[PDB]
Target: Nucleolysin TIA-1 isoform p40
Amino acid sequence: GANHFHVFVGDLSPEITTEDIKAAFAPFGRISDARVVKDMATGKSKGYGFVSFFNKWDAENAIQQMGGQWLGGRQIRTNW
Model:
């Protein structure tokens, strides 16, 4: 169907899950999908995740606003 606008999130704490990373990016707008990439073998957090918004003037906010903000005792990268 119609494509969404995907936001990369780097430097996540290993304790961070799909539940709380969705809660951190919910204040900007509604989320079509969000997840933290786990390793297929072990199941621990790889370090990064994705958050896809419906609107672009929304992900654009989420990238600029969260660029270096603390989440789980670690500053995060944000980009497309």
